[PDB]
Design an enzyme around this catalytic site. Structure first.
Site, PDB file in Angstrom:
ATOM      1  N   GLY A   1       2.820  -3.076   7.208  1.00 18.33           N
ATOM      2  CA  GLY A   1       2.549  -4.427   6.780  1.00 18.33           C
ATOM      3  C   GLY A   1       1.509  -4.430   5.672  1.00 18.33           C
ATOM      4  O   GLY A   1       0.651  -3.556   5.589  1.00 18.33           O
ATOM      5  N   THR A   2       1.652  -5.400   4.772  1.00 16.42           N
ATOM      6  CA  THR A   2       0.728  -5.497   3.655  1.00 16.42           C
ATOM      7  C   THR A   2      -0.698  -5.542   4.161  1.00 16.42           C
ATOM      8  O   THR A   2      -1.037  -6.314   5.058  1.00 16.42           O
ATOM      9  CB  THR A   2       0.994  -6.741   2.816  1.00 16.42           C
ATOM     10  OG1 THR A   2       2.281  -6.635   2.203  1.00 16.42           O
ATOM     11  CG2 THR A   2      -0.073  -6.883   1.743  1.00 16.42           C
ATOM     12  N   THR A   3      -1.529  -4.688   3.589  1.00 17.02           N
ATOM     13  CA  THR A   3      -2.931  -4.684   3.935  1.00 17.02           C
ATOM     14  C   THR A   3      -3.504  -6.076   3.720  1.00 17.02           C
ATOM     15  O   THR A   3      -3.239  -6.730   2.707  1.00 17.02           O
ATOM     16  CB  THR A   3      -3.695  -3.643   3.122  1.00 17.02           C
ATOM     17  OG1 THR A   3      -5.042  -3.564   3.601  1.00 17.02           O
ATOM     18  CG2 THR A   3      -3.684  -3.973   1.638  1.00 17.02           C
TER      19      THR A   3
ATOM     20  N   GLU B   1      -3.637  -9.369   0.209  1.00 15.04           N
ATOM     21  CA  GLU B   1      -2.963  -8.962  -1.005  1.00 15.04           C
ATOM     22  C   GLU B   1      -1.551  -9.518  -0.984  1.00 15.04           C
ATOM     23  O   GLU B   1      -0.877  -9.466   0.046  1.00 15.04           O
ATOM     24  CB  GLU B   1      -2.946  -7.443  -1.098  1.00 15.04           C
ATOM     25  CG  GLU B   1      -2.293  -6.920  -2.326  1.00 15.04           C
ATOM     26  CD  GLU B   1      -2.443  -5.426  -2.445  1.00 15.04           C
ATOM     27  OE1 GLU B   1      -3.036  -4.814  -1.533  1.00 15.04           O
ATOM     28  OE2 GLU B   1      -1.970  -4.858  -3.444  1.00 15.04           O
TER      29      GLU B   1
ATOM     30  N   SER C   1      -0.404  -8.708   8.861  1.00 17.20           N
ATOM     31  CA  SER C   1       0.379  -7.612   8.320  1.00 17.20           C
ATOM     32  C   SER C   1       1.545  -7.361   9.259  1.00 17.20           C
ATOM     33  O   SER C   1       1.374  -7.285  10.479  1.00 17.20           O
ATOM     34  CB  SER C   1      -0.442  -6.332   8.150  1.00 17.20           C
ATOM     35  OG  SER C   1      -1.436  -6.486   7.153  1.00 17.20           O
TER      36      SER C   1
END
Lengths: 244, 102, 233, 243, 205, 244, 241, 250, 242
Positions: free
Chosen positions: A30-32, A47, A75
């Site tokens: 998952g996106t930080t 982000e 995330s």
């Protein structure tokens, strides 16, 4: 035997659910994203990975708000948390419907953890592929929570999830040491921005966008709201300077 | 007891033209002796060159007319934007009305 | 492993992945190509309608859910039909309850969250189609892509299905041009025309092959098929 | 076949390994906790471990106040803890609601044990891999100690502990209690009893503990509550005196 | 009010004052001209500092209260002490929902630290109002003029008390249904205190 | 997924067989031998108490021969528990039927009643059948005495005499040997007892090892009379066989 | 609550459960029926694996659904009963609802779906029974012969057999029966039946059981004697050469 | 969620067996050896109170439990299974019998009723059979004293006396040795002591052992007076004292 | 085993994929949409002379203006057939008119995916896909005559003409050449009937095949054996020229 992982509610021979643990896999993937409880309140920083120019800036929005005082960010697989988020939005509504108050963050925290854990309780129920950093200002200050597919969340002086969380967790630990006082939401805004870019260095391979939201007993009065415009742009260049 | 119904006043008149057709009612809406709205358009095109009006307790016909145009929408969805025949709607609406039969 | 981890929607990979989803996502590629893009004033849907045979007709990849809103599809049709209808209700519902044209963005959320059920819920399957959706509204023209994963995205332009990548590049390649084209759907079209031509591989779009739909500022969601597309063929 | 491992059904030996694996997730959190009936009171002492600064330590507890009277400490996954506590919390009020008086501690345990017993027998239900510990001062029983397992199995305790080193703490108190011959601490002030336990906690763990180190809770007549780190430290003060 | 259950009425009044709120009500419960139980406490604790003045069907109130008490207790067992307001919200729900089955007026009052005392009326309409003070029940009729003219904010504890003591006595005097004894309940940061008054006093004021 | 765990009870053999049914039948082989005979004047019921012992209490004990009605009692081949279920149900069913028509149920109706009930598990539910089969002993107006049977498959037949449990074929042989149509109950009694003693897998055929009953229109009658013999009575008639 | 889908397309697109039900059908003792010009006759082999049974109280392999309409089958006696049941309800229903007993087809088509349903029904297995349906329509004498199978498929037959060995006797029947000349006489129709029967039954009278539907709810089952008399006659004519 | 195990969990073996039951029996055999004895004047049941730790308070666990003032039960197996069944047993007795008949069912029916439950576990999906078997003793007016033994098979039959659990074989062996019809309870009581002593390994005393009887009605235990018809419970539980008292009488 | 809604590693539905097998196992069924009408013809495929082909109908009439044929596992359609017919009636019940053939057709294919075990997102109770495919011919005011091929996939297309069932593809190829818009109902009869006889294992006759049409004037109309036999014989004459 083997294949204990192959069904959710099953206990591993060591008494574990690898599905959740596997769900944890994409969580890291998952996106930080991070969250910060400043002095009065909390800040939510994530982000936004830019896949292409065809993406329209600012439009696809990650951080989601529950009630008006509770922001949430995760995330993981977006539709998951979203699905979950709605349920939270449901929860507070019911809660407030019953209790006439907006829900306490910890109250709100608890309800979900059950519902997540529920998805640990059945081999037919797919655990959640997300971990939500969430919180907001409530009757007593704010709170900063990140809930795992494990059904585990905690109070967080700072919180981070996704890929770059280490770079984050680093920086968070620092600011704790930099500011055991607390932090101003403004700096909370600013520092996260740096952290994100730093966190992005793991994913540095692609460009992204920066979304940050916040809940300030002072500045949002306790509402939860995005960081926008100059103040948003501030922390950017503030970080975009400091990143160098 | 709460009464489920009432009257908003206002008479409507349909007339079938040979080649054409026309329908009208007043724009006056009232309650008892109080005028709700002197201007309250009571008659509505539902599409497909087909207009509708319901005189009676408005909110009934109101939601009804609403529901009817709703039906129209799905008709065009399902019949692939086929025009709805003026008769069909009647047969249709009958259901809507008779759907409330009790 | 596969047979272990690819079997059930409910079951993650050891890497925490859903192959059924991934497979459902695969069928998107199997599906034919459709293309879409928007201006700020308008949004354009461009589909290549596939047949079984020449004796057969070309399956339409485009659906109108509403006056401001309709969609295109590449994937298993019935799911879309399920969803489109579901969506149509919502728009109509919004229209019913709030007298409110459904916000394109807000629209995507439901479907995003809707299929999300299939994802986490045992016994079912994700929908077998990825989806492109255009709408014009108070926020203007919008182009929304859907993923059977639930993931939705607002784009300036895009395409899905078989080999949609070429135009997708070409679209990205062409980015700022069409989006600036405003009030000239034709070029917005002709852009997408050139676009879908990019990922045209086997054949050229024809009157029947191609399908076109548009919503716009004063342009309700509408569809151009055949003779309609002729001047843009 | 071998799914018997995966589900809850008697092994060829008549065993439930999902249960026994749930017994793993118990000490998985690796907290050595204890409970002792004081004279009038009952005290639970437990390890409060904070791995991270970024955490809120204060938010970290396995000792949960189920009722006005009944607190409960949990050993196992925090979600199940967060899960189970609510279940209990639901009961007492409803018990209190239905029965006009607060649920005596055992009843809760007895009640809760059933659930596991249900989960034990039910397949699609997995059991929870937590061991639960129910104490309070029961108006009829005064100090009382009850500990339930994922098996739906539970019993009273003169005192009890839980954790990886639970075994040793068990021995220590057994020795002490055999030495004392009495079921509960003679000490009237839980304060001492706290210090007493922490002693034997420090003792049987051979490990010193700071204010943050320990999770502590206090069962009193009609009230359960948990101490502050100050109270902890306060006890930590006097233990440093006697020892 | 159902046929066969005892009728409350009496006279309930709750008044916030400088240190908090104090609740009071008569003790008299009647079925028609017959006084069912003269001593009955109509003041009730759903929650430590959160309390209620029960009017309407005793059965209703008695039944309702614990339910609120239940949830609050549960709520508290979760989230701790709710706002006295939040407590009222609970009653309102059941009230507003079961109003068709419910005959109860309720003055909800609780001491908050941050809010000091509070008062919330829920008449049979299920509506809710936070008030400096509130009165309900049959005898409340007689005392409005008395109360209003004589009420003041942030009075003493005792100033309120006698203001209470006289008000009820009037209701008790004037109302038949109001009577028995005056039970008063103290809500402050100091805590909860019940007060009783015998007729031989408050009848004479 | 749940699929892993389904034994899939009702699924067909590639040969179109149901192994559970097969295996249920198989356990019935293991069931205590039970025999019944329709005499001319009555119907005999005798079955071996199986797995017996000293401190086993015989008198109250009935593990096999149960009475659904005063015109319908049954012998049980299978799990004692499972039958008692069906036993109770049928009684109600009969009672219902009685309570419906104020008339006793023609046995097959009750029989076919249970028949399909067994068949209920057969064709649906993923549910194991009962490991039980039955001797249906009944008297009716229509056919008078009626001796029926059932199998977990629910398939069921009538009989002039029949045996179930172990040694059936042996008994059946002995029965299909020694039986004759006009046999009086008391003959069939011993005949079974003969068959029993012989088909007895244990050393001796003894009352304490037996359940015994009869359906008979008595001499003073018009009420066709069911009787279960007391252990002594069994032991008594045990002697009358010369078996002693 | 048990929804599990037993009936599923094979990799090659088959439902083996159906196909296995066909086996219990084959495993089922053979059953046959033939329609005489005015009439229809139903032969059935009594499962002969056992004897000493009371056949009176033991049901007949053939059963009446309605006074003018009967059914026979091959498969599990259990599965039939339920099938047997609902059809009986159905006719009465049709009788009640339509003021009229069913057409043989009507119930036939009805019963078919029931099987056919349980196919794409989940959580249930199909029946293991294929059936033969006999009856003469209301106000129609005409022979109506219908064959159904767990797949839920039905059809009309000049004659039909089912169960074990049905192919064998079918071959007999296929040649022995002539469409141009139905065995108009019940007996000759019965005769042709029993002829076909011993082709499988392997020498038994009791082993055989017979039933005949005539018009207007006229339906009769035949005694072994009647049977044997045909058995006798049939044997002779065979023996004669 | 939404239990999709609707299918019977225990299925007939190719050999026609139900393994879970068999394994239940296995687990049941594993159970703490527990006994019961039906004497002339009454019935007694006994078992060893198992302490898995002296810190634990044994009395807080009751393996013997009254179902009705004339009926109480005991098991060998998993405590928890026994626990819940007690409640149901208690409940169904009130509901399905008392709340119908206003009294406490004859030992058989309740037993018959209880076993019914255990069968259901065997059959219905999503559930497993219970990890215990039950020695159940009760006195009723007409059938007097009776002693029953119920399995996870849901099968049940009477006894003159019996034992379940591990040493039960050895017990029952010695029981058959010892038992006669004319045994009065006290000797039978003493007998059980003797018998269970064998099954007993560690300490043997009232604090280690659990004893109760189906005795004569106990007006003292009736908790009130003035009712002639009800002279109180026949069941009682025995004190470690009384036990250790008779453990002197060993 | 493996789930029923389980996607292929390519994202396809095995059962659906397999359902297509029994489709080809279905009798070859063919129809031609003309401007004159829509000819239908199908393979009786009697498994025995004792089997009376009269009782074999894989051609069915949904309504006058709309009818269809089946190829596949037949009685599956019964529900669908009963379902389909209902909708038109239902449509007519609501709309006092005929239904657009597509609208009906489209509606029917919505039955397709409704198999599942407690499926996620809806309750659609069926175990498996339908084991049959459908040629669907109807005349509607809007679209005139049309021919759609219904599929257990829930997908359907318009067809100038279509060949489904066993000998479909080859017959299909035949249709490819043979078909043109200007074909006549009779020609289409001839074409189908010939191409039938082509693909038919048995010698084509009225008994081992079945015919029907749907004609805007008359709507759905079955061809009897006799008219069939003539056309047959007619082909036999026409088929033998050069």
């Amino acid at each position: 035997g083997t294949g204990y992982d192959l069904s959710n509610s099953v206990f591993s021979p060591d008494g574990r659910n690898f599905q959740v643990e596997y769900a944890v896999k994409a969580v890291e993937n998952g996106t930080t994203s991070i969250g910060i409880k400043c002095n009065d309140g909390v800040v939510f920083a994530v982000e936004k990975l830019i896949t292409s120019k065809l993406l329209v800036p600012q439009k696809n929005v990650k951080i989601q708000v529950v009630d008006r005082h509770i922001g949430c960010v995760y995330s993981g697989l977006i539709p998951d948390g979203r699905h979950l988020v709605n349920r939270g939005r449901e929860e507070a509504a019911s809660f407030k419907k019953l209790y006439k108050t907006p829900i306490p963050i910890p109250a709100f925290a608890d309800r979900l953890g059950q519902y997540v854990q529920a998805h640990t309780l059945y081999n037919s129920v797919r655990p959640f592929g997300v971990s939500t950093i969430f919180g907001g200002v409530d009757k007593n200050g704010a709170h900063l929570y990140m809930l795992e597919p494990s059904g585990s969340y905690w109070g967080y002086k700072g919180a981070a999830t996704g890929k770059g969380r280490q770079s984050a967790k680093a920086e968070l630990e620092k600011l704790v040491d930099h500011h055991p006082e607390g932090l101003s939401a403004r700096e909370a805004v600013k520092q996260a921005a740096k952290i994100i870019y730093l966190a992005h260095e793991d994913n540095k391979e692609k460009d992204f966008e920066l979304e940050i939201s916040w809940c300030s007993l002072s500045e949002t009065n306790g509402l939860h709201k995005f960081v926008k415009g100059d103040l948003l742009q501030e922390a950017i260049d503030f970080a975009q300077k400091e990143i160098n | 007891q709460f009464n489920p119904y009432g009257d908003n006043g206002g008479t409507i008149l349909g007339i079938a033209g040979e080649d054409f057709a026309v329908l009208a009612g007043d724009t006056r809406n009232i309650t008892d002796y109080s005028i709700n709205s002197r201007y309250e358009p009571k008659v509505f095109d539902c599409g497909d060159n087909i207009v509708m009006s319901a005189n009676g307790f408005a909110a009934d016909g109101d939601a009804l007319v609403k529901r009817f145009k709703n039906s129209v929408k799905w008709y065009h969805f399902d019949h692939n934007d086929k025009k709805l025949s003026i008769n069909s709607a009647a047969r249709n609406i009958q259901h809507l009305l008779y759907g409330k039969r009790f | 492993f596969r047979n272990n981890y690819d079997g059930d929607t409910v079951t993650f990979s050891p890497t925490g992945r859903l192959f059924q989803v991934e497979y459902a996502l695969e069928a998107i590629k199997q599906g034919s190509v459709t293309v879409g893009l928007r201006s700020n004033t308008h949004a354009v849907l461009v589909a290549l309608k596939r047949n079984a045979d020449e004796l057969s007709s070309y399956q339409k990849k485009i659906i109108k859910c509403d006056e401001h809103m309709g969609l295109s599809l590449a994937g298993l049709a019935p799911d879309a039909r399920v969803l489109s209808n579901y969506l149509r209700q919502q728009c109509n519902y919004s229209s019913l309850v709030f007298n409110r044209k459904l916000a394109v963005e807000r629209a995507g959320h439901l479907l995003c969250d809707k299929a999300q059920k299939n994802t986490q819920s045992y016994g079912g399957r994700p929908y077998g189609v990825g989806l492109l959706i255009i709408g014009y509204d108070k926020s203007g023209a919008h182009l929304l892509e859907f993923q059977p994963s639930g993931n939705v995205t607002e784009l300036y332009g895009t395409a899905i299905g078989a080999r949609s990548q070429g135009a997708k590049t070409y679209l990205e390649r062409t980015l700022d041009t069409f989006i600036k084209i405003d009030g000239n759907p034709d070029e917005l079209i002709k852009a997408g025309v050139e676009a879908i031509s990019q990922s045209l591989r086997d054949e050229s779009l024809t009157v029947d092959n191609l399908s076109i739909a548009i919503v716009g500022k004063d342009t309700p969601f509408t569809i151009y098929d055949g003779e309609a597309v002729a001047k843009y063929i | 076949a071998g799914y018997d491992r995966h589900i809850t059904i008697f092994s060829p030996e008549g065993r439930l390994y999902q249960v026994e694996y749930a017994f793993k997730a118990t000490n998985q959190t690796n907290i050595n906790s204890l409970a002792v009936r004081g004279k009038d009171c009952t005290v639970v002492i437990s390890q409060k471990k904070v791995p991270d600064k970024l955490l809120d330590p204060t938010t970290v507890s396995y000792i949960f106040c189920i009722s006005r009277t009944i607190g409960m400490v949990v050993n196992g996954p925090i979600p199940d803890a967060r899960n189970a506590a609510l279940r209990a919390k639901a009961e007492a009020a409803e018990f209190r609601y239905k029965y006009g008086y607060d649920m005596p501690c055992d009843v809760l345990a007895k009640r809760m044990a059933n659930l596991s017993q249900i989960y034990t027998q039910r397949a699609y239900m997995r059991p929870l891999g937590v061991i639960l510990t129910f104490v309070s001062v029961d108006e009829e029983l005064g100090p009382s100690i009850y500990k339930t397992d994922p098996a739906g199995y539970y019993v009273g305790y003169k005192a009890t502990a839980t954790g990886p080193k639970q075994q040793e703490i068990t021995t220590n108190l057994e020795n002490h209690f055999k030495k004392s011959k009495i079921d509960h601490i003679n000490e009237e002030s839980w304060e001492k009893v706290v210090e007493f336990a922490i002693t034997h906690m420090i003792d049987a763990l051979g490990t010193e503990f700071s204010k943050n180190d320990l999770e502590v809770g206090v069962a009193t007549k009609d009230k359960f509550f948990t101490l502050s780190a100050e109270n902890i430290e306060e006890r930590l003060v006097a233990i440093a005196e006697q020892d | 009010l159902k046929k066969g259950e005892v009728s409350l009425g009496t006279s309930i009044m709750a008044v916030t004052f400088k240190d908090g709120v104090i609740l009071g009500a008569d003790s008299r419960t009647t079925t028609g001209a017959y006084i069912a139980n003269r001593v009955t406490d109509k003041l009730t604790r759903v929650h430590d500092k959160i309390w209620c003045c029960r009017s309407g069907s005793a059965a209703d109130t008695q039944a309702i209260a614990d339910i609120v008490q239940y949830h609050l207790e549960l709520y508290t067992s979760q989230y701790g002490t709710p706002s006295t307001e939040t407590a009222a919200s609970v009653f309102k729900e059941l009230c507003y929902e079961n109003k068709d089955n419910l005959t109860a007026g309720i003055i909800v009052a609780g001491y908050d630290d941050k809010n000091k005392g509070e008062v919330y009326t829920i008449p049979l309409g299920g509506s809710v109002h936070k008030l400096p003070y509130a009165i309900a029940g049959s005898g409340s009729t007689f005392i409005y003029g008395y109360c209003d003219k004589n009420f003041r904010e942030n009075m003493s504890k005792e100033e309120t008390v006698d203001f209470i003591k006289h008000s009820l006595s009037q209701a008790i005097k004037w109302d038949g249904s109001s009577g028995g004894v005056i039970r008063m309940v103290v809500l402050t940061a100091a805590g909860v205190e019940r007060l009783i008054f015998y007729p031989d006093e408050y009848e004479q004021l | 997924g749940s699929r892993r765990y389904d034994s899939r009870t009702t699924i067909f053999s590639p040969e179109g067989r149901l192994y559970q049914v097969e295996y249920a039948l198989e356990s019935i082989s293991h069931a205590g031998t039970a025999i019944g005979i329709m005499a001319s004047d009555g119907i005999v019921l005798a079955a071996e108490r199986k797995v017996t012992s000293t401190l086993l209490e015989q008198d109250t004990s009935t593990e096999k021969l149960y009475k659904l009605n005063d015109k319908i009692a049954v012998a049980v081949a299978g799990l004692t528990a499972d039958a008692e279920i069906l036993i109770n149900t049928a009684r109600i069913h009969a009672q219902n039927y009685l309570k419906t028509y104020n008339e006793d149920i023609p046995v097959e109706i009750l029989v076919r009643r249970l028949s399909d009930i067994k068949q209920g598990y057969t064709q649906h539910g993923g549910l194991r059948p009962f490991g039980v089969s039955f001797i249906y002993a009944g008297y009716d107006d229509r056919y008078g005495y009626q001796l029926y049977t059932s199998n977990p498959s629910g398939n069921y037949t009538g009989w002039k005499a029949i045996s179930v449990g172990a040694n059936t074929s042996a008994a059946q042989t002995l029965l299909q040997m020694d039986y004759k149509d006009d046999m009086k109950v008391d003959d069939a009694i011993e005949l079974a007892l003969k068959t029993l003693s012989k088909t007895t897998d244990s050393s001796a055929l003894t009352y304490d090892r037996l359940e015994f009953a009869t359906i008979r229109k008595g001499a003073n009658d018009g009420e066709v009379y069911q009787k279960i013999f007391k252990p002594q009575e069994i032991k008594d008639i045990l002697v009358k066989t010369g078996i002693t | 609550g048990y929804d599990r889908a037993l009936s599923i397309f094979s990799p090659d697109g088959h439902i083996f459960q159906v196909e296995y039900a066909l086996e219990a059908v084959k495993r089922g003792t053979c059953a046959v029926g033939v329609k005489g010009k005015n009439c229809v006759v139903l032969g059935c082999e009594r499962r002969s694996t056992l004897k000493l049974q009371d056949t009176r109280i033991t049901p007949s392999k053939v059963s009446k659904i309605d006074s003018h309409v009967v059914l026979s089958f091959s498969g599990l006696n259990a599965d039939s009963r339920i099938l047997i049941e609902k059809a009986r309800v159905e006719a009465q229903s049709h009788r009640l609802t339509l003021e009229d007993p069913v057409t043989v087809e009507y119930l036939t088509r009805y019963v078919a779906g029931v099987q056919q349903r349980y196919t794409q029904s989940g959580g249930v297995r199909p029946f293991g029974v294929s059936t033969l349906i006999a009856g003469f329509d209301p106000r129609d004498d005409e022979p109506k012969l219908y064959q159904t199978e767990p797949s839920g498929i039905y059809s009309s037959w000049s004659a039909q057999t089912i169960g074990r060995n049905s192919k064998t006797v079918r071959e007999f029947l296929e040649k022995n029966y002539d469409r141009k000349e139905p065995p108009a006489t019940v007996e000759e129709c019965v005769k042709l039946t029993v002829r076909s029967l011993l082709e499988v039954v392997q020498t038994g009278a009791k082993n055989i059981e017979i039933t005949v539907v005539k018009p207007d709810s006229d339906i009769v089952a035949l005694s072994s004697e009647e049977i044997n008399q045909y058995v006798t006659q049939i044997e002779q004519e065979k023996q004669e050469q | 969620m939404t239990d999709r195990y609707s299918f019977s969990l225990t299925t007939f073996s190719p050999s026609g067996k139900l393994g879970q039951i068999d394994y239940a029996l296995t687990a049941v055999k594993q159970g703490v050896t527990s006994l019961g004895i039906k004497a002339t004047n009454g019935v007694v049941i006994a078992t060893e109170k198992k302490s898995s730790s002296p810190l634990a308070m044994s009395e807080t666990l009751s393996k013997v439990s009254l179902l009705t003032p004339d009926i109480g039960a005991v098991y060998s197996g998993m405590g928890p299974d026994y626990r819940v069944l007690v409640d149901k047993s208690r409940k169904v007795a009130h509901t399905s019998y008392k709340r119908i008949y206003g009294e406490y069912p004859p030992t058989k029916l309740l037993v018959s009723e209880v076993a019914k439950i255990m069968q259901e576990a065997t059959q219905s999906g999503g559930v497993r059979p219970f990890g215990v078997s039950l020695l159940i003793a009760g006195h009723d007016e007409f059938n007097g004293f009776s002693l029953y033994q119920v399995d996870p098979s849901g099968s049940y039959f009477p006894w003159k006396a019996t034992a379940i659990g591990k040493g039960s074989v050895a017990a029952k062996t010695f029981l058959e040795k010892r038992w006669n019809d004319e045994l009065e309870l006290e000797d039978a009581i003493h007998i059980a002591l003797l018998t269970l002593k064998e099954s007993v390994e560690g300490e043997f005393n009232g604090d280690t052992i659990e004893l109760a009887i189906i005795g004569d009605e106990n007006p003292d235990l009736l908790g009130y007076t003035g009712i002639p018809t009800d002279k109180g419970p026949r069941f009682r539980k025995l004190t470690s004292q009384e036990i250790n008292d008779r453990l002197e009488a060993l | 085993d493996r789930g029923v809604s389980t996607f292929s590693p390519e994202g396809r539905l095995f059962q659906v994929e397999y359902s297509l097998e029994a489709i080809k196992l279905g009798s070859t069924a063919i129809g031609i949409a003309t401007k004159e009408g829509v000819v239908l013809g199908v393979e009786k495929r009697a498994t025995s002379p004792l089997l009376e082909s009269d009782s074999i109908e894989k051609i069915v009439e949904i309504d006058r203006h709309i009818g269809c044929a089946m190829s596949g596992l037949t009685a599956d359609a019964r529900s669908m057939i009963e379902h389909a017919r209902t909708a038109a009636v239902t449509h007519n019940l609501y709309y006092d008119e005929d239904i657009n053939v597509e609208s009906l057709t489209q509606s029917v294919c919505d039955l397709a995916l409704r198999f599942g075990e407690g499926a996620s997102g809806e309750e659609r109770l069926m175990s498996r896909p339908f084991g049959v495919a459908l040629l669907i011919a109807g005349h509607d005011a809007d679209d005139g005559y049309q021919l759609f091929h219904a599929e257990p996939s829930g997908t359907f297309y318009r067809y100038n003409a279509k060949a489904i069932g066993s000998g479909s593809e080859g017959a299909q190829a035949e249709l490819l050449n043979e078909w043109h818009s200007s074909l006549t109902l009779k020609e289409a009869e001839l074409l189908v009937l010939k191409i039938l006889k082509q693909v038919m294992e048995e010698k084509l006759d009225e008994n081992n095949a079945q015919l029907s049409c749907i004609t805007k004037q008359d709507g759905f109309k079955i061809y009897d054996n006799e008219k069939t036999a003539e056309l047959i014989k007619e082909l036999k004459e026409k088929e033998a020229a050069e």
